[PDB]
Design a protein around this nucleic acid. Structure first.
Ligand SMILES: [Mg+2]
Ligand SMILES: [Zn+2]
Ligand SMILES: [Zn+2]
Ligand SMILES: [Zn+2]
Lengths: 61, 84, 168, 519, 93, 229, 88, 58, 171
RNA sequence: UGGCCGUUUUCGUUGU
């Protein structure tokens, strides 16, 4: 999977708009680690924002 | 020889706490690894709970062998032992 | 895997040259000592069975097992099918064949007669029953374990055994 | 279940037989002879064969599978090698016993100084306690200044006066009184002399001396062949990863080998007596400090660092010896430690358990029809979600790691398989404080999953733990099997502990706020 | 799992728990022994399905026992001290 | 043969008190009515006054108690302390029986003295400690329950039952069954590593603590010092 | 190689200040030549697995003996919570 | 105490240990004859005769 | 020399098989497992006596594993050859290194140096065999040989037959 | 493409 170790944000959920890093990507439920808190939270793949060449790209990168 | 006949058994007929615990654990293990259940299960899916209930009904097929200090032993049935 | 009746048998300071098996020197080993012990510990001295007596015992046990499997209702090779396993089946078949070809005595009457006649060492008598001869000459030539006993009585024994010899 | 299949039947230990080793025994068991002090062949990997690091002894690394058993680190128990001494040497731990045995027997005829004729001794033989029997025998025979060649009728003796043996530290001197007064010419009771003297001792005297012909044959108390333990017992310490330092025991073994080799190469050249004696003493010193570095009265042996060596006696004695260090007690698994805090709102037999721990620890659970669904749920929860599982176990013993398993859904549970589910509420677990003075310092509680990272106890149970929340800590343990769960539940639950068999009275009680309030 | 913890566990009379707490949650290990000398020296190759005791020339009287690895370590450290504990699975008297 | 948790400080009233008090408490006299059971407490007060076959049973039991008091007071407890740990508390069983059957008021007892003494005597031989028919076994059984039986008799005396407790027949039956079962459960079980328990129980109190008194004295004792300070 | 991650390092092997670090994360990647390709072994300096925060100030100077000699001052703030200690 | 001295004496006297005590099996990791281990469990075939006829093991 | 022996084998049963009739199940397990094996201590195992009436006694429960073991004590009939046995032999095949004398379950090895000089092999004749003065060794004919070698390899014992002593050969 | 390796020994300071 070429979709690991990238900066990622949350577009929907109780943490709307928090910068997070993909720590573990087993499957269909991405484990992403945030910066503001000292914790990592699971989250579905479709509730995130992925950085791309330009702007923030949803789960199509 | 090392056995002693059931007519002359001398040990206490009550079931000691240690015997209770050992039988319960043994049965619950056996129960939990595909052993048959000698009484009904209704809601107590816990094998330990099944063992507790089965003992309460005196339906457990295990014989205690107590060792005398000398080396002789006697055979008590979990059926016959008076459970308090 | 398998076990026997003797216990302990630890390493001792004193070894024994009387441990290599030898039938002529009466060296059977430690597990076949003169006084063995049974499951219950009773007086149980060693049992040595003649070829014909062993054949009869195996045959009766096998027919009893066949009856028990059938549960309410003999041939040598047919008797070999009762046991389970290709190796087990073959070995039972071949031991039945060996008993058939070298069991000096066949029928119940004659085996009972020889048992009553023959029946001091257990093994020597068992092997004398197992070992056949023609005269005392061949008996002494082939059996180096009875050369000097001061009681032979072997000529009449051989005459009786050849008398029971089934004609062939 | 952990171990692979093995054909040998499994039973338990009933008897442990102590007794020394007959040198022929050592030879019969050793699989190699050690001759080369150089452990590493040419610093080109593959340590020198026949050296202290021989690959026949036992595998020490993951890659190499032991040559002898033919297995790897997982299974191979190591293997032994023997080592011959050109000169037989003493055993430092038998100096007093060897001295006494010599006192009890003759010098040249090498038999007991007294026969059954003296009723005192025949009585002494009636002692069944070998130690006390030998004690009494020594008590009588320590005054027999002269060995009788004739009955007190020749007894086969020597007739020469028995010397007075006095302990010169590491050596033994016998001061004879040769046949009013003669010049007393004492000499060193050399090891070979004693060995030959003991070699002919009768089984009669042996048993009468408390020894045993089958196992404890006195001459073996003199060191002739020295077995060498595989590296398993003397692993090396990688100071900084690639940098590897040698175990001090290996150094001592190598130095003994060097001293032995040197002692070999004295008789083939000029050996002006004095040199042989000094070299012999040096070899004995090595072999001694190799087996006890705390010999009283004499200086200890060191490394190039100057620190005293680690002889096996140290390895076994002291608080950190094998017994008190790793046999009576040991560091165990499935545990956890934390601070404690009050909780008026919890039951008596319950305890706050931070979520992280219940996520970390886990308990195997066999697969039955009664929990198939619940176990599948715990499986799909993933190991990072409470409740959750951590591994899946097959009938063959394989462990599936849910961390590196992306096919979680495609796992189908099977009866008899095990699932290390997370800890759940109401489960039984031990609990403890240090010091554990009285048995009311350990109990079996029930689990309640909660946030935050502290344990919490009902404010009443503090007294049995003699604990307070001014910073105290507790430890935990978890059963890994059902029988153990049964035992904990039926034997160590808090309720059964309420009254103390120490003083036949209740041990807990209403304390502090509850008490001062209910007043 | 210090001394006092062992003693408290004994006092509560819980045997099997103490067993496993000192066996499976710690250095669980397996060995083989010769029934004649009683020692662990039996050279065995499991996958190869062979067994023998060099000193005893012993190929059939072999067992396997499960013991703490620290215990086997202690036995080997001992028999390097000229002291040979022989392990027998049957009592004598 | 008792666990250490199944005991409680009780009082055996047979020990203390005066001869006069003992007599006025336990003694009975069927011939004399001015010092006999109150008739308003029994349905058969007529059948008793002046009778003898009952007087002999009462005399036997009273002599048993007299012997017990002499034995205890002269052998067991020399100073006169009558407070000690004994198994199976009684006062509680008595009052539980009282509550279970509403035994207040002056309702006359319907329980025959012979039944009471028969049960009491039978009970004293039913407290199993060792089970077997060897003589020595029976002697040991007798020796074990000596003080417990003394307590039982000190409590369940006919005067005491009929006046202070006013039990009925079924109440008495329940009391006897309760004492039996409670004692039978109060045994030390097999396998108790009693040694460890005693060790801990003795060690722990030391933690919290002109002759020499304190830990030094305990150390002296434990090591058996030849020359004490 | 370790089981952790390396991506937070620079192109030259040091992590830049201001980057958040987590447990089991490599912060200094050091390599050792292997005594004889594929002749190098990981010699990293992973962050203590029980710590979290943000790298703050990276230092890079020579030691007394003229080799590279680094120092990473990671920081975080401790919120009082259940299980702290206090005293008058 | 005196672990080394005791061990050397045991070797010297050819002593035999029965594993009778508790601490023995503790070192050997076996069920010491205490508490729950102070007896054995005999599986009875007689009482299992009471089971229904259709519960014959395969 | 056939022998009756008192044989006992420990058997293991899973707790899943705990019902009315473990006795019979253990019995056929024993019949299937013990029979047909050859061992140095005892030898080839062929038959067991009263297979239907073996007293398995009261079984054990292994602590911590839940398995149950039964000490199946019984009496069987086994055979093993000992050194110095003179018994009749059966020949089934001929090889240059020594005729294959399958005497009972095992095969008896015939040393080339231990064969009578007058006894020779003739490939031309059918069946291939040896003929001599008052002697012939062919498939199915009674032959006397002495066994002086018994090499057991714990799995299938090796027996060495000899015909180089007095009165050894075809009667 | 699974599989997967991080020192010891000292001394110190503290903690309950
Ligand atoms: Mg405090
Ligand atoms: Zn190996
Ligand atoms: Zn002499
Ligand atoms: Zn051996």
């Amino acid at each position: 999977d070429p979709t690991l170790n990238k900066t990622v944000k949350i577009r929907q959920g109780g943490y709307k708009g928090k910068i997070g890093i993909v720590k573990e990507a087993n499957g269909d439920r991405f484990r992403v680690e945030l910066h503001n808190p000292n914790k990592t939270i699971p989250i579905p793949c479709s509730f995130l924002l992925i950085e791309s060449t330009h702007g923030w790209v949803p789960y199509e990168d | 020889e090392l056995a002693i006949l059931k007519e002359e058994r001398t040990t206490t007929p009550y079931l000691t706490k240690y015997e209770r615990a050992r039988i319960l654990g043994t049965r619950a293990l056996q129960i939990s690894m595909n052993a048959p259940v000698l009484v009904d299960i209704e809601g107590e899916t816990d094998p330990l709970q099944i063992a507790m209930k089965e003992l309460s009904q005196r339906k457990i097929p295990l014989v205690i062998r107590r060792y005398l200090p000398d080396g002789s032993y006697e055979d008590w049935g979990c059926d016959e032992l008076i459970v308090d | 895997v398998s076990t026997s009746t003797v216990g302990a048998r630890r390493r001792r300071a004193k070894q024994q040259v009387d441990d290599e098996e030898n039938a002529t020197l009466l060296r059977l080993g430690p597990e076949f000592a003169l006084k063995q012990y049974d499951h219950d510990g009773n007086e149980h001295d060693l049992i040595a069975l003649s070829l014909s007596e062993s054949r009869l015992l195996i045959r009766e046990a096998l027919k009893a097992r066949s009856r028990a499997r059938n549960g309410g209702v003999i041939d040598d090779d047919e008797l070999a099918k009762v046991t389970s396993g290709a190796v087990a089946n073959g070995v039972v078949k071949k031991t039945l064949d060996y008993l058939n070809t070298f069991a000096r005595f066949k029928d119940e009457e004659t085996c009972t007669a020889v048992d009553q006649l023959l029946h001091l060492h257990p093994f020597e008598i068992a092997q004398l029953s197992s070992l056949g001869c023609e005269d005392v000459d061949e008996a002494i030539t082939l059996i180096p374990s009875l050369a000097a006993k001061k009681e032979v009585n072997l000529q009449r024994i051989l005459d009786e055994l050849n008398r029971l010899e089934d004609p062939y | 279940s952990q171990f692979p299949y093995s054909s040998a039947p499994l039973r338990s230990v009933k008897e442990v037989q102590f007794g020394l080793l007959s040198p022929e025994e050592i030879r019969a068991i050793s699989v190699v002879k050690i001759e080369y002090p150089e452990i590493m062949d040419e610093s080109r990997q593959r340590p020198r064969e026949g050296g202290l690091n021989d690959p026949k002894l036992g595998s020490i690394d993951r890659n190499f599978k032991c040559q002898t058993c033919g297995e790897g680190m997982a299974e191979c128990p190591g293997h032994f090698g023997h080592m011959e001494l050109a000169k037989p040497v003493f055993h430092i731990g038998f100096i007093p016993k060897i001295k006494k045995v010599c006192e009890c027997i003759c010098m040249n005829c090498g038999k007991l100084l007294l026969d059954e004729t003296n009723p005192t001794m025949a009585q002494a033989i009636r002692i069944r306690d070998p130690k006390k029997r030998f004690n009494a025998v020594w008590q009588l025979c320590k005054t027999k200044m002269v060995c009788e060649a004739d009955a007190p009728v020749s007894r086969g003796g020597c007739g020469n006066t028995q010397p007075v043996v006095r302990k010169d530290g590491m050596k033994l001197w016998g001061t004879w009184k040769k046949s009013r007064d003669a010049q007393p010419e004492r000499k060193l009771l050399t090891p070979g002399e004693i060995l030959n003297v003991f070699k002919h001792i009768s089984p009669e005297d042996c048993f009468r001396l408390g020894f045993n012909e089958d196992y404890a044959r006195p001459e073996w108390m003199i060191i002739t062949v020295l077995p060498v333990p595989p590296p398993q017992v003397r692993p090396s310490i990688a100071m900084d990863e690639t940098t590897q330092g040698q175990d001090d025991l290996t150094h001592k073994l190598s130095d003994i080998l060097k001293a032995n080799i040197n002692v070999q190469k004295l008789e083939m050249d000029g050996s002006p007596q004095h040199i042989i004696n000094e070299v012999e003493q040096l070899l004995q010193f090595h072999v001694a400090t190799y087996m006890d570095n705390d010999i009283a009265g004499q200086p200890q042996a060191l490394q190039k660092s100057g620190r005293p060596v680690k002889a096996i006696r140290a390895r076994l004695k002291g608080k950190e010896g094998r017994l008190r260090g790793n046999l009576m007690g040991k560091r165990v698994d499935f545990s956890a430690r934390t601070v404690i805090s009050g909780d008026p709102n919890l039951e008596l037999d319950q305890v706050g358990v931070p979520i992280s721990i219940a996520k970390t620890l886990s308990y195997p659970e066999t697969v039955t029809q009664y929990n198939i669904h619940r176990l599948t749920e715990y499986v799909r929860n993933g190991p990072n979600e409470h409740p959750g599982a951590k591994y899946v176990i097959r009938d063959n013993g394989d462990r599936i790691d849910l961390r590196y398993h992306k096919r979680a859904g495609d796992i189908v549970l099977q009866y008899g398989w095990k699932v290390e589910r997370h800890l759940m509420d109401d489960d039984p677990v031990l609990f403890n404080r240090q010091p554990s003075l009285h048995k009311m310092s350990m109990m079996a509680h029930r689990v309640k999953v909660m946030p935050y990272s502290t344990f919490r106890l009902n404010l009443s149970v503090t007294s049995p733990y003699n604990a307070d929340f001014d910073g105290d800590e507790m430890n935990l343990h978890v059963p890994q099997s059902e029988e153990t769960r049964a035992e904990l539940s039926q034997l160590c639950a808090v309720p059964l502990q309420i009254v103390s068999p120490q003083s036949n009275k209740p041990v807990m009680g209403i304390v502090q706020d509850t008490l001062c309030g209910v007043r | 799992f210090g001394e006092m913890e062992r003693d408290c566990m004994i006092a509560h009379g819980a045997a099997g728990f103490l067993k496993e707490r000192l066996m499976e949650a710690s250095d669980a290990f397996r060995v083989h022994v010769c029934g004649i000398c009683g020692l662990m020296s039996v050279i065995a190759n499991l996958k190869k399905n062979q067994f023998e005791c060099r000193s005893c020339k012993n190929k059939t009287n072999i067992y396997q026992l499960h013991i703490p690895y620290a215990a086997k370590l202690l036995f080997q450290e001992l028999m390097a001290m000229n002291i040979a504990p022989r392990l027998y699975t049957e009592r004598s008297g | 043969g008792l666990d250490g948790t199944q005991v409680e400080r009780q009082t055996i009233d047979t020990i203390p008190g005066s001869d006069k008090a003992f007599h006025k408490r336990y003694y009975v006299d069927l011939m004399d009515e001015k010092n006999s059971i109150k008739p308003d407490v029994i349905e058969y007060a007529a059948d008793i006054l002046g009778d003898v076959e009952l007087q002999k049973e009462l005399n036997s039991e009273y002599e048993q108690l007299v012997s017990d008091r002499k034995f205890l007071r002269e052998i067991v407890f020399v100073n006169g302390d009558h407070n000690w740990p004994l198994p199976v508390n009684l006062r509680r069983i008595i009052q539980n029986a009282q509550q279970i059957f509403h035994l207040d008021r002056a309702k006359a007892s319907d329980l025959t003295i012979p039944e009471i003494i028969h049960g009491v005597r039978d009970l004293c031989k039913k407290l199993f400690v060792l089970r077997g028919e060897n003589e020595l076994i029976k002697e040991a059984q007798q020796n074990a329950t000596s003080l417990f039986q003394c307590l039982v008799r000190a409590r369940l005396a006919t005067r005491r039952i009929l006046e202070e407790f006013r039990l009925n027949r079924d109440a008495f039956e329940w009391v006897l069954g309760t004492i039996e079962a409670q004692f039978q459960r109060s045994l030390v079980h097999p396998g108790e590593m009693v040694g460890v328990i005693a060790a801990q129980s003795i060690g722990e109190p030391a933690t919290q603590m002109n002759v020499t008194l304190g830990v030094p004295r305990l150390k002296e004792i434990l090591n058996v010092a030849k020359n004490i300070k | 190689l370790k089981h952790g991650t390396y991506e937070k390092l620079d192109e030259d092997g040091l992590i830049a200040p201001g980057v958040r670090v987590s447990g089991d994360d490599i912060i200094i990647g050091k390599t050792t030549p292997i005594p004889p390709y594929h002749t190098k072994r990981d010699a990293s300096t992973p962050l203590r697995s029980t710590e979290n925060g943000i790298v703050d100030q990276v230092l890079l100077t020579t030691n007394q003996e003229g080799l590279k000699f680094v120092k990473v001052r990671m920081r975080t703030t401790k919120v009082p919570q259940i299980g702290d200690k206090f005293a008058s | 105490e005196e672990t080394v001295e005791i061990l050397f004496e045991a070797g010297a006297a050819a002593e035999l240990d029965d594993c009778r005590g508790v601490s023995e099996n503790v070192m050997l990791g076996q069920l010491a004859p205490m508490g729950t281990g102070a007896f054995d469990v005999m599986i009875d075939e007689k009482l299992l005769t009471s089971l229904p006829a259709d519960y014959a093991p395969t | 020399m056939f022998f009756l022996k008192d044989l006992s084998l420990i058997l293991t049963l899973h707790p899943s098989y705990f019902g009315p009739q473990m006795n019979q199940y253990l019995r056929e397990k024993l019949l299937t497992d013990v029979e047909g094996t050859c061992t140095g201590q005892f030898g080839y195992i062929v038959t067991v006596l009263d297979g239907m009436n073996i007293d398995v006694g009261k079984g054990r429960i292994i602590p911590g594993s839940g398995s149950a073991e039964f000490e199946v004590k019984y009496r069987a009939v086994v055979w093993k050859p000992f050194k110095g046995e003179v018994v009749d032999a059966i020949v089934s095949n001929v090889s240059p290194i020594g005729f294959f004398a399958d005497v009972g379950p095992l095969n008896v090895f015939v040393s080339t140096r231990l064969i009578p000089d007058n006894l020779v092999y003739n490939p031309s004749n059918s069946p291939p065999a040896y003929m001599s003065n008052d002697e012939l060794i062919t498939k199915g004919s009674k032959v006397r040989l002495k066994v002086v070698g018994t090499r057991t390899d714990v799995n299938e014992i090796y027996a060495i037959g000899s015909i180089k002593e007095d009165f050894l050969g075809a009667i």
